[PDB]
Design a binder for this molecule. Structure first.
Ligand SMILES: CNC(=O)COc1cc2cc(Nc3nc(N4C[C@H](C)C[C@H](C)C4)ncc3Cl)ccc2n(C)c1=O
Ligand SMILES: CNC(=O)COc1cc2cc(Nc3nc(N4C[C@H](C)C[C@H](C)C4)ncc3Cl)ccc2n(C)c1=O
Lengths: 122, 122
């Protein structure tokens, strides 16, 4: 029927991360407290429920700058933004709470589910 | 060190395909002979060498419409565009030549490599 390429999706995500690193077609700036993070709107919607809900709306779709709440941990958002482009989540006892709280706000249910499994096993 | 999410990259590609289907943040129109195809510039660069070379250039980065050569097979490009968002390539004896020639023009080396293996086995 159709030939399946097992490592194609991982190769696409790696190339999207290379474009983000080189600032190619990054159409949004995420402001967390005092820290700024440039990313692709499409990647944000695909991994986050909050970013999907914001960018589907035509009033917020063309927004160049998205200002998140100052209560949101900058290191927590950075770990989650890195995870979106690499599929690797840096979860440790020193950041577990900061990552879990940020994943709840960004509406990343599967990340919250793994954060639930992390402190259950540790 | 870092927790690996094996199906994250496939879930991202599936969501990007859902956005393409719903015309959310599709910033380019690809014109093949008389057929039109809307896609994301970032997805094109990630899977194609030709689209990477075009959109890295600042003179062609903001181009809303990309006109390919009329010699390019519309069904051949459609199969390859579908593959970019699904990781599934529809290669059969009736389209093998049309897909191989289009993959060469779009500079998709791994697709050309699988097209090489297809007629070698059939
Ligand atoms: C480890 N991975 C994660 O944690 C990812 O978690 C999440 C990702 C996530 C993505 C989106 N984005 C889209 N959602 C749809 N659809 C919605 C589905 C419920 C139904 C489907 C038809 C369309 N389409 C296109 C996008 Cl871009 C919406 C909500 C999301 N939520 C709530 C998540 O928890
Ligand atoms: C089944 N899959 C395929 O057929 C995909 O095939 C191809 C994909 C492809 C992608 C790009 N795009 C980028 N290439 C880099 N780098 C280049 C690498 C050679 C070195 C690396 C550091 C950066 N970065 C960011 C993008 Cl978006 C360039 C050329 C490409 N060519 C020649 C392909 O044949």
């Amino acid at each position: 029927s159709q030939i399946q390429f097992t490592r194609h999706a991982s190769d696409v995500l790696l190339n999207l991360n290379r474009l983000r690193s080189r600032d190619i077609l990054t159409d949004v700036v995420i402001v967390v407290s005092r820290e700024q993070f440039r990313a692709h709107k499409t990647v944000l919607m695909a991994c986050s429920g909050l970013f999907y809900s914001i960018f589907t709306d035509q009033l917020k779709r063309n927004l160049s700058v998205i200002n998140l709440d100052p209560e949101i941990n900058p290191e927590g958002f950075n770990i989650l933004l890195d995870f979106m482009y690499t599929s690797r989540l840096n979860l440790r006892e020193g950041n577990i709470m900061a990552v879990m709280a940020t994943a709840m706000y960004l509406q990343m249910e599967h990340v919250v589910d793994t954060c639930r499994k992390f402190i259950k096993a540790s």
